[PDB]
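User: Can you fold this complex?
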Amino acid sequence: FQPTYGVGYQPYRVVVLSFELLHAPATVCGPKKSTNLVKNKCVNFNFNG
Amino acid sequence: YFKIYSKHTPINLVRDLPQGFSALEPLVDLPIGINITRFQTLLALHRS
Ligand SMILES: *[C@@H]1O[C@H](CO)[C@@H](O)[C@H](O)[C@H]1NC(C)=O
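Assistant: Here's the predicted assembly.
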């Protein structure tokens, strides 16, 4: 590995992520984007499912 | 799902289970997804 080598003989750091899709109890989840809370109005609420 | 419910109770009875009512709060749900058919308690020795 030299810096003068062209692109293709240069080092590439590779990270491979592996998942199992919805067959066991899951421990890794994506983030939840909660909005602001509005009171005293007829709204459609979604609280923790 | 492995549900662990637990309750801490301050008692002062010597030998047996006290007679009373105490509902166990849900403590922790565990994502284990495994078969379990047998169990064993773990104790601690005292060495001198
Ligand atoms: C769980 O284990 C018991 C005893 O080892 C066995 O009889 C049972 O079929 C197993 N269950 C599954 C879903 O493999």
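The pocket of 2-acetamido-2-deoxy-beta-D-glucopyranose is lined by residues B 35, 37 (CB under 6 Å). Chain A touches chain B through four residues (CB under 8 Å).
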